[PDB]
Design a protein around this ligand. Structure first.
Ligand code: MG
Ligand code: MG
Ligand code: MG
Ligand code: MG
Ligand code: MG
Ligand code: MG
Ligand code: MG
Ligand code: MG
Ligand code: MG
Ligand code: MG
Ligand code: MG
Ligand code: MG
Ligand code: MG
Ligand code: MG
Ligand code: MG
Ligand code: MG
Ligand code: MG
Ligand code: MG
Ligand code: MG
Ligand code: MG
Ligand code: MG
Ligand code: MG
Ligand code: MG
Ligand code: MG
Ligand code: MG
Ligand code: MG
Ligand code: MG
Ligand code: MG
Ligand code: ZN
Lengths: 52, 50, 88, 146, 81
RNA sequence: UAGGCAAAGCCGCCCGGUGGAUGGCUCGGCUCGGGCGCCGAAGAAGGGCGUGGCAAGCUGCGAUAAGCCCGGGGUAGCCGCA
RNA sequence: CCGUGAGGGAAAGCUGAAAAGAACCCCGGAAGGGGGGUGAAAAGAGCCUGAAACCGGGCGGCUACAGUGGGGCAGGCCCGAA
RNA sequence: UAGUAGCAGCGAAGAGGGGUGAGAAGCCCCUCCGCCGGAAAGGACCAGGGUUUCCUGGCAACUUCAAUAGGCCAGGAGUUAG
RNA sequence: GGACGGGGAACGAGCCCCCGCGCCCGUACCGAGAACCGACGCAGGUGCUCCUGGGUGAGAAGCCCAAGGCGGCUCGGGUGACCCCGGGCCAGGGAACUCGGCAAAUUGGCCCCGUAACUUCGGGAGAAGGGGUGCCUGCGGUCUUGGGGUAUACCCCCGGGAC
């Protein structure tokens, strides 16, 4: 059931919405911060040296 | 959705405005070089992550 | 305005419908009538026009049980097309 | 434009029941508005066929036969038909209202009413006829109960 | 504040039948602002304002005028007809 | 006996269809050398949305929206990629 | 464009000196075809050159009693202008 | 390989006549036949989708066949609250 | 909303009449065997989430038909070989099949009679086993629901309903 039948439950939920600061589809509505730029939990922009 | 927020609605409106192929006079102006647009899409095929 | 140039009465036997699949017997009967009329009037099967009473008689017992035979009147018109009617 | 959709909306019936005359096949392509559909309806080229109601003559005949008592034998029953609890409620209410009316009018001493009431609650009597017959036979009232 | 007028079939029918003008205005304009703007610019009396935001992201207003002013006449006067 | 004499099929050349190699080209990249070196609450960088007569994208710009004013250079053409 | 997301991420250059970008006639439902034009050259917008694999046609040889590819010798048919 | 597999199975399906059209089994209309009817099917509607809605026109591409049809393509329009 | 208190003015209502204002955002459509997710116009999943007439029927079961919709689970025709998938019947025998009764077959609703060992005394139990079952013509009963009779129950008459 973990494949195609479970894929049908991804039709109505959401983890992220568009971030107001960086515009990506990365704002975690429940955690209340952006997973890309870190808005809502860090006033400085989130960017790590291990990322190209 | 029946009930929408205005920001999501405005982003959808922006996608609706941009979704269109280049005009025929633009094709003639560029001598058949500009035929397609990157913002052209189909609602069933390519999904906005609004 | 279409004038009749020939008229015949025929008894078309549809016993071949019992030798085909039960899910297509009435439609097969329509094809049988068209082929019979084309053969006996020397025209193509597309030049034959079935009448409404004939169609309803063929479809009276739904798709599975067309009648075993039909008594019909065939008329050849001045343009070359043929009309087939259930005799009544 | 779909003529049948507008015609069904105008006539307030189903599109399955809206009927368009073949004589208006030429005029169908010129139909633009619901006013045009109304004009065609007024001319009579578009009408609504009557709906089918399931005929009830067979049911009425069978219902008369069932009232007379046919077609309700052992071979025609598949589940419970008689309600025991409702029957008990009706039996108690019939006997209790009869006995209470008798006591209220004074034909029965309250002690005799108590004995009859407890017997009724204890299921001594099959029916109101049995209760009346018991009352008459044991002479619990000064005048007979009909 | 007013961007333009809507001169479609629905807008023309509304103008001729209900004394309403259809305008495209700024998305942030409120009903109060639209009514005051219409009254100031055209010197008519506004009966009521209905507003909606189109799927293309524009605010459209149906301005119903008072019962002494003609929407069709005003449209002819401005020459947008 | 063999040729006229041929099925399906096989090999080689020529022409065509497909394909986009090869060659030529280059307003692109890469390396090295030299310079220059901070911006932001006077609200930055970044993003969204919008903005052209016909305009979808890029570029530019910001409701004054491929744009407004002033001065210097540049003279007769101009309205970006197109 | 892909992934809920952190992240990941292509393919894709070339008409001609000049559009001179193919008038006009016949056919076709249309894409389009024939004739006729422009051009030094179709180089025809699916646009420099245009390989091989592959497919179609023509030509040469074989082809239904004879087991296949490579080499040497002898021969039959075909080419053998430079 | 190969003009081959598949375009069956999950309890519905088509036929006659006419019209349009280059072209019609399949588009439009009538008649007949069938399927659902506490519903893979009728009414409402959440999330999600985001113009797929409506009108006009069309068939280079899309729909496991066709097409004059279309959730497709082109143009235009449409969502009104104490 | 009410009550219990403090303070203030000379006015004044929860009643009647009349006047004025109510901003902002959503609002199309699908809502799924083609508009969502599953690379698809995907037999899955999400949502059958909430609602639905008549007959038979214990029944929101099945079967047939309304209202309403559909023939678009998006190939058509011919043939009636073998073979495969799904379904029907099969004389005599009756598990001899086979690892194994797998599969298939049998029984089947309701009413009446009847029901063992054992038991934790509740159960076992629908144990098991046997009989009845259609249609038609009449005769009744128990109630129910109204109306009329002296008439609130009973009683008589009339119309409807159930068993
Ligand atoms: Mg897992
Ligand atoms: Mg969660
Ligand atoms: Mg999808
Ligand atoms: Mg029966
Ligand atoms: Mg009990
Ligand atoms: Mg509103
Ligand atoms: Mg040969
Ligand atoms: Mg910026
Ligand atoms: Mg070339
Ligand atoms: Mg030589
Ligand atoms: Mg074939
Ligand atoms: Mg096959
Ligand atoms: Mg059925
Ligand atoms: Mg049915
Ligand atoms: Mg439904
Ligand atoms: Mg539509
Ligand atoms: Mg249309
Ligand atoms: Mg579209
Ligand atoms: Mg709606
Ligand atoms: Mg499908
Ligand atoms: Mg049912
Ligand atoms: Mg109906
Ligand atoms: Mg079909
Ligand atoms: Mg077939
Ligand atoms: Mg046997
Ligand atoms: Mg054995
Ligand atoms: Mg054995
Ligand atoms: Mg078994
Ligand atoms: Zn962010």
């Amino acid at each position: 059931m973990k494949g195609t039948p479970s894929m049908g439950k991804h039709n109505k939920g959401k983890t992220h919405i568009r971030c107001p600061r960086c515009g990506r589809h990365s704002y975690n509505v429940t955690k209340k911060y952006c997973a890309s730029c870190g808005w809502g939990r860090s006033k400085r922009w989130r960017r790590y040296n291990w990322a190209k | 959705a029946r009930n929408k927020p205005l920001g999501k609605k405005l982003r959808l409106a922006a996608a609706l405005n941009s979704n269109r192929n280049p005009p025929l006079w633009v094709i003639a102006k560029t001598k058949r070089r500009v035929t397609r647009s990157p913002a052209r899409r189909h609602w069933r095929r390519q999904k906005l992550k609004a | 305005e279409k004038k009749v140039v020939l008229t015949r009465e025929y008894v078309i036997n549809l016993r071949r419908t019992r030798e085909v699949s039960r899910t297509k017997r009435a439609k097969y009967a329509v094809g049988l009538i068209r082929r019979f009329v084309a053969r006996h009037l020397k025209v193509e099967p597309k030049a034959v026009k079935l009448g409404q009473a004939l169609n309803e008689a063929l479809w009276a017992r739904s798709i599975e049980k067309p009648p075993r035979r039909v008594h019909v009147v065939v008329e050849k018109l001045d343009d070359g097309t043929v009309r087939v009617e259930l005799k009544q | 434009v779909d003529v049948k959709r507008l015609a069904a909306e105008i006539l307030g019936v189903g599109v399955s029941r809206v009927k368009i005359s073949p004589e208006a096949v030429g005029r169908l392509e010129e139909v633009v508005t619901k006013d045009d559909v109304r004009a065609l309806i007024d001319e009579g080229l578009i009408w609504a066929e009557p709906e089918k109601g399931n005929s009830r003559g067979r049911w009425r005949e069978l219902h008369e036969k069932k009232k007379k008592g046919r077609r309700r034998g052992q071979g025609s029953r598949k589940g419970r038909r008689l309600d025991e609890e409702e029957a008990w409620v009706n039996k108690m209410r019939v006997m209790r209202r009869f006995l209470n009316t008798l006591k209220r009018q004074g034909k029965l001493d309250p002690a005799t009413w108590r004995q009859l009431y407890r017997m009724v609650k204890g299921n001594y009597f099959r029916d109101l006829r049995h209760l009346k017959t018991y009352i008459n036979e044991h002479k619990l009232t000064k005048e007979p109960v009909k | 504040m007013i961007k333009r007028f809507v001169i479609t079939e629905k807008a023309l029918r509304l103008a001729e039948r209900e004394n309403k003008i259809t305008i495209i205005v700024e998305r942030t304009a409120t009903k109060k602002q639209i009514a005051d703007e219409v009254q100031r610019l055209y010197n008519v009396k506004v009966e009521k304002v209905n507003t909606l935001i189109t799927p293309r992201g524009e605010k459209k207003a149906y301005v119903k005028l008072a019962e002494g002013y003609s929407a069709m006449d005003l449209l002819t006067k401005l020459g947008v007809l």
